[PDB]
Amino acid sequence: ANNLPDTQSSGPAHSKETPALTAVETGATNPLVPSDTVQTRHVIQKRTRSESTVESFFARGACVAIIEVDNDSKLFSVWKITYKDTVQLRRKLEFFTYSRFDMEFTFVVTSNYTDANNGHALNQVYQIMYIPPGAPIPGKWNDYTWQTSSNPSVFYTYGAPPARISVPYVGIANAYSHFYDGFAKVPLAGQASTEGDSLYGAASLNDFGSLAVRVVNDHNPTKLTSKIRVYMKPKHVRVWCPRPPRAVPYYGPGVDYKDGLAPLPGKGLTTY
Amino acid sequence: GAQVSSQKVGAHENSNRAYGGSTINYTTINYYRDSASNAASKQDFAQDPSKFTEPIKDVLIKTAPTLN
Amino acid sequence: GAQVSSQKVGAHENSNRAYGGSTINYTTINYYRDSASNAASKQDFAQDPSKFTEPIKDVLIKTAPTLN
Amino acid sequence: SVRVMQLTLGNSTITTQEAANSVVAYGRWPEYIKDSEANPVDQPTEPDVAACRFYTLDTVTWRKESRGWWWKLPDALKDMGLFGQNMFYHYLGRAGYTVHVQCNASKFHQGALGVFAVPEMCLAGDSTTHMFTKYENANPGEKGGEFKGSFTLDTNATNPARNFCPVDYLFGSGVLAGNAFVYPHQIINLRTNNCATLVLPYVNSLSIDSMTKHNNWGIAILPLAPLDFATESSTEIPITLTIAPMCCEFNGLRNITVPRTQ
Amino acid sequence: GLPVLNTPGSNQYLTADNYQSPCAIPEFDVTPPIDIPGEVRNMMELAEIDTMIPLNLTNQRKNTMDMYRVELNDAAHSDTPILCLSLSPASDPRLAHTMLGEILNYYTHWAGSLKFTFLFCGSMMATGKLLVSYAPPGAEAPKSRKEAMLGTHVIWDIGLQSSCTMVVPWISNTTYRQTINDSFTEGGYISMFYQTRVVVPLSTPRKMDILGFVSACNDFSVRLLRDTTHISQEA
Amino acid sequence: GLPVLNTPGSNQYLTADNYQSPCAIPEFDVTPPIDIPGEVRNMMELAEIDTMIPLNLTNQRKNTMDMYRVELNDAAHSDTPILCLSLSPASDPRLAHTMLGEILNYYTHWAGSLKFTFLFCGSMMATGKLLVSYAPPGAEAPKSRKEAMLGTHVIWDIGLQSSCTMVVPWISNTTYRQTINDSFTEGGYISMFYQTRVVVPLSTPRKMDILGFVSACNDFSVRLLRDTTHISQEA
Amino acid sequence: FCGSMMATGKLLVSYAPPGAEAPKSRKEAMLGTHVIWDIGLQSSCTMVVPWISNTTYRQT
Numbered sequence A: 001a002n003n004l005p006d007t008q009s010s011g012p013a014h015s016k017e018t019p020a021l022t023a024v025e026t027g028a029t030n031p032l033v034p035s036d037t038v039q040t041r042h043v044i045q046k047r048t049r050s051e052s053t054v055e056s057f058f059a060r061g062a063c064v065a066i067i068e069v070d071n072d073s074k075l076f077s078v079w080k081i082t083y084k085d086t087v088q089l090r091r092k093l094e095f096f097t098y099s100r101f102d103m104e105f106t107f108v109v110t111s112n113y114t115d116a117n118n119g120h121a122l123n124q125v126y127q128i129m130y131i132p133p134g135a136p137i138p139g140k141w142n143d144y145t146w147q148t149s150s151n152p153s154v155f156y157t158y159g160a161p162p163a164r165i166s167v168p169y170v171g172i173a174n175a176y177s178h179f180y181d182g183f184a185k186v187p188l189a190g191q192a193s194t195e196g197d198s199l200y201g202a203a204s205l206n207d208f209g210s211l212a213v214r215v216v217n218d219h220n221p222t223k224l225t226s227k228i229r230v231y232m233k234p235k236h237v238r239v240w241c242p243r244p245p246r247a248v249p250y251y252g253p254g255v256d257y258k259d260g261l262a263p264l265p266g267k268g269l270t271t272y
Numbered sequence B, C: 001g002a003q004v005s006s007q008k009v010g011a012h013e014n015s016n017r018a019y020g021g022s023t024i025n026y027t028t029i030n031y032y033r034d035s036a037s038n039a040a041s042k043q044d045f046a047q048d049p050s051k052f053t054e055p056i057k058d059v060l061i062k063t064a065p066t067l068n
Numbered sequence D: 001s002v003r004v005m006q007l008t009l010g011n012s013t014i015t016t017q018e019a020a021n022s023v024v025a026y027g028r029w030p031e032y033i034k035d036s037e038a039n040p041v042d043q044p045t046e047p048d049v050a051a052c053r054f055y056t057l058d059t060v061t062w063r064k065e066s067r068g069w070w071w072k073l074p075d076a077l078k079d080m081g082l083f084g085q086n087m088f089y090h091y092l093g094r095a096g097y098t099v100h101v102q103c104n105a106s107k108f109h110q111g112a113l114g115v116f117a118v119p120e121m122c123l124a125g126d127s128t129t130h131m132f133t134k135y136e137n138a139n140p141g142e143k144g145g146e147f148k149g150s151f152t153l154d155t156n157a158t159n160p161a162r163n164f165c166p167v168d169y170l171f172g173s174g175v176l177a178g179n180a181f182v183y184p185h186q187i188i189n190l191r192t193n194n195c196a197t198l199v200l201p202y203v204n205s206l207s208i209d210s211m212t213k214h215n216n217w218g219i220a221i222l223p224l225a226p227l228d229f230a231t232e233s234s235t236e237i238p239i240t241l242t243i244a245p246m247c248c249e250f251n252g253l254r255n256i257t258v259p260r261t262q
Numbered sequence E, F: 001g002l003p004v005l006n007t008p009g010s011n012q013y014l015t016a017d018n019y020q021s022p023c024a025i026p027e028f029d030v031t032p033p034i035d036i037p038g039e040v041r042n043m044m045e046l047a048e049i050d051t052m053i054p055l056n057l058t059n060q061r062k063n064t065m066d067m068y069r070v071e072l073n074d075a076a077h078s079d080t081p082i083l084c085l086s087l088s089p090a091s092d093p094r095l096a097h098t099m100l101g102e103i104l105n106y107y108t109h110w111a112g113s114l115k116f117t118f119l120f121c122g123s124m125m126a127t128g129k130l131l132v133s134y135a136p137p138g139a140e141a142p143k144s145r146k147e148a149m150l151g152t153h154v155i156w157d158i159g160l161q162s163s164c165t166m167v168v169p170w171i172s173n174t175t176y177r178q179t180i181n182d183s184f185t186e187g188g189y190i191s192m193f194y195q196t197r198v199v200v201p202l203s204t205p206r207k208m209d210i211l212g213f214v215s216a217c218n219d220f221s222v223r224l225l226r227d228t229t230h231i232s233q234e235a
Numbered sequence G: 001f002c003g004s005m006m007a008t009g010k011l012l013v014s015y016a017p018p019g020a021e022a023p024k025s026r027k028e029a030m031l032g033t034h035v036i037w038d039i040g041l042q043s044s045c046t047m048v049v050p051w052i053s054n055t056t057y058r059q060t
């Protein structure tokens, strides 16, 4: 996040040192600066790379999900936690193979009457319950699971500033894997083809669990719908192994492609 | 437990406060026990790109012949 | 009356603030007279399970024969 | 000089008189797990010279029409001597590698091969079903696979191939191939060098993993400038791949694993 | 007054927050404590106590005292397993309801070593050698003593010391495993075989039981508190 | 309590704010880090790595491996350009999709020097001299070697060192340029010509390819994070 | 190597201690002691057959 070096003045040359010539076969990039190939003046550099630090690049709340609940089973909804339901944050994360950070979740809740001239309801309170992989998932908008004696819940009152909570680095590995070239199972010799088969590039069937959202108020016959837009921001970021960015449209959770396979336009070789 | 850092002043007001004093510092205090609750300090460091730009075993000088 | 404790930093930002200073400390001040109003400090200790795992009168070594 | 080298590992030695230096991926040389980064508590096995030696996989042939080749590690070495034995007898395994690609021609030939080492080299499949490639197809072993010039969707619903369909300009994963240079690599330009040498440390989000379930590195070879000779529309030059595992340590010994095949 | 700015998250109720609040019964004279025996500081203390495993969940034995008894006999040597188990402490039906399994079901991740102790309840005149085994995941689950003997194992000789402990070391790829049945974080197999055979003289019972116990080692830990599926409430 | 006064901006949600919030999973035992190779601290590190330029976007070559190959031949000397490009790193179709261009499309401003490296992939028996040029904006785009030679240029002699780098110095009026095609912040023209001609002996290929690479210099910086147009989502 | 200067090539010279099947393919040979010879300026290549024996001396 710092300063750039100054340009030193450089005069003419006539020597056996040729920085302009190189050999990219080695796998290295030629570290030339302007003064290597032209005469330069002294410039005191004041520009910095403060905004392109790994932290500043991700320091934005991106939408990862839009959970919908109809307060007239739709009285409650469950969202399997992921960053792949949307494309924008996903593409930025995928510039790297591994990552490690904390997360900040902000929830923007909106609601409205479906009918322009019918129904009425008192102010709604929402419960956003996190169900860690293993915990019982709600079957009804009002069954015993909503007691949350151990699961973390967030109760949001409609109209209040967006709710917000922080989550630590929760991975079971030392870093989050954006790419996993493997399987969760190894098919063994002799077992039925139905056996030992698993998805390519998938780890746990339930990585991070899911969110169960519901309106706590008793539902009125009035037609109402609410939407909880989930925004996530990685804070305290560290990333490893850069990768080229996604060039064609995403086709699922994997690196699969199908449709926009011809991303580049035509342009004449000798056309400026 | 307050942390006092200085800001990098961009646009300067016609004040001496825009050039010195606590007027170009900002104060921070953590209220939560879990580090996850903390904001980002944003006083982030940089590093050498060499691991990517020149992952070569036998180090070479730009003035000198790459293929030797 | 402020209590300043340090946090156990999990994920580290690319800052020196993530490794030291008041930036890895958190501050606490009690506002109520009754201790019941206080939050939980969560700086909780552990103990020896022996009272449950080995409530034996005559202490025995694992290498040595239990039935002697 | 930058051009002459000799690599000795165990009982195997490789010599070259036309190198273009060597690349050490991310500037990290392979190493063993430190006590501060250790996870499994059992005593590891370290075959050393019996496993850390040069193994020559099958030779492929480069023609004017070739699109490219790919291999997965440790997969390509699963049947290689005592390295393969240790891989299958243990639940966990870790290793780094020295990849030496060989390709000689003459002063009247042209062509350039881009040799890339990719961590977590996930490839694209052939169906509309996501992540449908089956284990047997994803792990070809020493013979590896090939890149294609175009995407062709498998439509046989009765008998889906469940295979990869890596299109070359899309780097087999939906990214542009010209940007694959952000990964450790070397280029075998026929007018300059014979080979490419890459030293790969162990890369993963864990200190040790299952070698049968997970491939850490992928080796991709793409013709950047096609093979051409004098006036012989007909030209074929072989490309031999020699890889040596390094700092092998395995944990969790039991009965041998025999994976399902074909 | 002092100028303030309300940040997002204001007026919300996080079920896991840790704030101060006013006391509804001020100046209350609290009854002082007394030194009651058996105080607990950490839930892991309870996971380290041996608890009997319901190993025999066959239809006639499950949910009876017989689910805890695994019977042996003086038959000639056989290479077939006496029992088989999967190292899924929170999900395997035989482990999920032990004190260890009960606690693991209130957490999402577990890591550490475990130990299985077996008690021989035959007569004093009975002798025998058994092989207890643990095979890390990834290969075929052992079905003969020949395969089991290739993994971690303890050859138990029966005699004065009635019990034998086999430690299942922490051998994992991930730093923590999940408390659900998931192949990515699978733990391996536990099995028992006859090394020689149980031998008894005349006028002695030819069949006897062994009981199994499970507890966590001192390097065991759990994280991410969650709700258990072991308790429900209808209406 | 303490008298406070709510200022405008209260209860809003700025997507780019930086505040503290309560932790939903308190006292969680975080898995420590390991030293994984290839860590990145700044996005500009990636912009400094050579990435191959898709120079040949003709209808038959675009979106194929041929878009990266620019063919040369042993024809007699000509003063016509081998290729032409505009210095609009984020918007020119040939630069916009390189690693450099991809990163620039997440920012609104860019400033600094760039360098273009060309690799000769002909046979060893082939020789030749080429002129690579850069003309700052404001005049007619060079169409002959005679005009190109009047600006910044490097005369590349082909031989042992297979590649040649031409640095495009930061010559601008504004302190930062925009990442969109805009005349006010236009950058100039890049072109290549034959200085002499490519010469090959008998029994040698008369046509060969050259590949181009682009990367940022150590004085390069970007600012004002924005959203890219390189990724979309329908429905 | 007594070919012309224009000739190139890589060869694998191997040594397999006794006891197994004599190598008949490069695949078997590559598993024993071997030197991969790259042809070029240095015209020759040496492969050392190390003393690997059970007895302290062998018979002639």
Ligand SMILES: COc1ccc(OCc2ccc(COc3c(Cl)cccc3Cl)cc2)c(Cl)c1
Binding pocket: A064, A081, A082, A083, A093, A099, A103, A105, A128, A129, A130, A152, A153, A154, A165, A167, A170, A176, A177, A178, A208, A211, A232, F024, F025
């Ligand atoms: C590589 O990029 C990643 C890695 C992990 C991720 O998710 C991990 C994750 C795990 C638990 C929770 C649970 O968080 C919550 C809690 Cl406790 C309470 C209330 C609401 C929420 Cl929301 C949320 C996210 C995401 Cl979104 C991107």
